[PDB]
Design an enzyme around this catalytic site. Structure first.
Site, PDB file in Angstrom:
ATOM      1  CB  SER A 143     -12.182 -44.674 -16.016  1.00  0.00           C
ATOM      2  OG  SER A 143     -13.456 -44.289 -15.529  1.00  0.00           O
ATOM      3  NE  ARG A 158     -10.334 -57.859 -14.808  1.00  0.00           N
ATOM      4  CZ  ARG A 158      -9.529 -56.931 -14.293  1.00  0.00           C
ATOM      5  NH1 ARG A 158      -9.999 -56.049 -13.414  1.00  0.00           N
ATOM      6  NH2 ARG A 158      -8.251 -56.882 -14.660  1.00  0.00           N
ATOM      7  CG  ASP A 196      -9.810 -42.853 -14.986  1.00  0.00           C
ATOM      8  OD1 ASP A 196      -9.078 -43.791 -15.351  1.00  0.00           O
ATOM      9  OD2 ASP A 196     -10.355 -42.826 -13.864  1.00  0.00           O
TER      10      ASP A 196
HETATM   11  O1  LIG Z   1     -11.077 -44.780 -12.008  1.00  0.00           O
HETATM   12  C1  LIG Z   1      -9.735 -45.119 -11.759  1.00  0.00           C
HETATM   13  C2  LIG Z   1      -9.509 -46.565 -12.173  1.00  0.00           C
HETATM   14  O2  LIG Z   1     -10.537 -47.379 -11.654  1.00  0.00           O
HETATM   15  C3  LIG Z   1     -10.292 -48.748 -11.885  1.00  0.00           C
HETATM   16  O3  LIG Z   1     -11.266 -49.512 -11.216  1.00  0.00           O
HETATM   17  C4  LIG Z   1     -10.358 -49.032 -13.381  1.00  0.00           C
HETATM   18  O4  LIG Z   1     -10.058 -50.388 -13.615  1.00  0.00           O
HETATM   19  C5  LIG Z   1      -9.378 -48.148 -14.143  1.00  0.00           C
HETATM   20  O5  LIG Z   1      -9.648 -48.209 -15.527  1.00  0.00           O
HETATM   21  C6  LIG Z   1      -9.463 -46.693 -13.689  1.00  0.00           C
HETATM   22  O6  LIG Z   1      -8.327 -46.003 -14.158  1.00  0.00           O
END
Ligand SMILES: OC[C@H]1O[C@@H](O)[C@H](O)[C@@H](O)[C@@H]1O
Length: 470
Positions: A143, A158, A196
């Site tokens: 995620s 990132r 996620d």
């Molecule tokens: O965890 C929830 C979200 O957090 C964000 O900081 C991330 O970039 C996402 O990929 C993720 O879906």
């Protein structure tokens, strides 16, 4: 109440109220530009919203069956999960939890992360005695921003949510883990890299066909939804004939990056401050002011500026409060959760944790502050839901929601719902609400397994799972 707070503080509480209050007109403003940015992110020229394809081109029907593994990389601990999709429209999951070592989320030796995940997988294998043989499909919930041109790929854009590991960015995460699995000759194959929010979108649709979106109100914010291939202009002429134009396609919005141009969001000097001092300024504009990761940092800065203005915590040692990101969302949550008239829970926290004494009116202000930034976080976060539901013509539906903030933060559920009723203008009893936010299924566990199932079925049918030549 406020029937014993000095005029100096009441005047500050009134200003804090005015800046941290977001009315319905502003919410509707944010939403309209949000919709443009969603569309813009689907074009070749792109936009600040990535709009990354999830490579799930089907809705789960329930007839899905099989034994699928699924790992989930959180910031606190790794979660290995075995999922037996019975096809009875439900599932049977045997899971494990592996605590992340101390400096792991921040380690300079990145090989330790993959080495850790692989070793933890092997323990789960020997304890479940499933170390005989087919090759077990694996669903890897990663995620963090990662562009993917096919489902079993994840090029890290990132790190976020407190992660900082040296040589992983700009790299495909999947082969990093895969060739670590093969070194141990584990009978696993990574069949899919899943976000996620997408795993959530699918896990919930699996048990609720009215699921229109999967959102995360957690230590990070993001939302996924089913679009149609034809709408995704940037994939124009990059797909095989087994992915038709009327085909569904799960989109990982990654809209925590929304409005990095700063043209609509009601950022205040405290918001700007949080941004300027954060690891990578100019990023995650939307996320920085709705995300659990930053909510406490906001409180910290307001407290510091009010102190360096001779108004609060006068002649106290703020040595401990000077450390950035010392306050996580538990503090605002617990402060708001204080059942005591004299806010005795709050008192104990600033004494035990930070070694600072507060008067009653000082806690009255701190408490009202935690209410303001928390309610604004809710009202702003649902702007992504209204934007997606309106870009698509979703008149009604359920929004599958998960996240530590949605779940643990006091009064957040109510605030997110009221914020949503304000945007649409709905009036009357909340049961009449055409669109409602419901508690989500297991997105990182069950969801990823349901996606590995949908993915292996396409592999078997020889059909594609990415752009041509990827
Ligand atoms: O965890 C929830 C979200 O957090 C964000 O900081 C991330 O970039 C996402 O990929 C993720 O879906």
């Amino acid at each position: 109440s406020m029937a014993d707070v000095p005029k100096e503080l009441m005047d500050e509480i009134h200003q804090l109220e005015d800046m941290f209050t977001v009315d319905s007109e502003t919410l509707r403003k944010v939403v309209k530009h949000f919709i443009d940015e969603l569309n813009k992110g689907l074009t070749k020229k792109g936009g600040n919203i990535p709009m990354i394809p999830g490579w799930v081109m089907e809705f789960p029907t329930g007839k899905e069956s099989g034994n699928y593994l699924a790992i989930d990389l959180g910031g606190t601990n790794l979660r290995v999960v075995l999922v037996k999709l019975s096809g009875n429209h439900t599932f049977d999951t045997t899971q494990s939890k592996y605590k992340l070592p101390h400096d792991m989320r921040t380690t300079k030796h990145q090989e330790e992360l993959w080495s850790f995940i692989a070793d933890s997988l092997k323990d789960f294998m020997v304890e479940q005695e499933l170390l005989n043989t087919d090759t077990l499909p694996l669903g890897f919930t990663f995620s963090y921003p990662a562009s993917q041109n096919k489902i079993n790929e994840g090029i890290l854009q990132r790190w976020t949510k407190g992660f900082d590991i040296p040589n992983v960015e700009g790299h495909d995460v999947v082969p990093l883990l895969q060739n670590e699995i093969s070194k141990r000759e584990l009978p696993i194959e990574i069949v899919a890299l899943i976000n996620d929010t997408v795993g959530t979108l699918i896990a919930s649709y699996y048990t609720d066909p009215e699921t229109k979106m999967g959102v995360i109100f957690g230590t990070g914010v993001n939302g996924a939804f089913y679009d149609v291939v034809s709408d995704i202009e940037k994939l124009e002429g990059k797909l095989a004939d087994d992915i038709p134009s009327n085909s569904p396609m799960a989109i990982n919005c990654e809209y925590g990056s929304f409005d990095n141009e700063h043209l609509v969001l009601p950022r205040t000097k405290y918001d700007v401050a949080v941004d300027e001092q954060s690891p990578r300024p100019g990023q995650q504009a939307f996320e920085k002011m709705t995300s659990g990761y930053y909510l406490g940092e906001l409180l910290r800065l307001v407290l510091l500026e009010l102190n360096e203005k001779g108004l609060m915590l006068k002649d106290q040692d703020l040595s401990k409060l000077k450390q950035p990101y010392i306050m996580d969302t538990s503090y605002p949550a617990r402060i708001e959760d204080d059942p005591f008239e004299n806010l005795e829970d709050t008192d104990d926290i600033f004494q035990k944790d930070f070694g600072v004494k507060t008067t009653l009116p000082e806690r009255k202000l701190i408490r009202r502050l935690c209410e303001l930034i928390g309610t604004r976080a809710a009202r702003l976060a649902v702007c992504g839901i209204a934007a997606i539901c309106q870009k698509r013509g979703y008149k009604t539906g359920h929004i599958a929601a998960d996240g530590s903030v949605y779940n643990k933060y006091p009064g957040f559920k109510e605030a997110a719902a009221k914020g949503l009723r304000d945007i649409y203008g709905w009036t009357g009893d909340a049961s009449k609400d055409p669109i409602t936010i419901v508690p989500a299924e297991d997105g990182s566990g069950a969801g990823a397994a349901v996606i590995a199932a949908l993915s292996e079925k396409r592999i078997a049918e020889g059909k594609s799972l990415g752009i041509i030549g990827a």
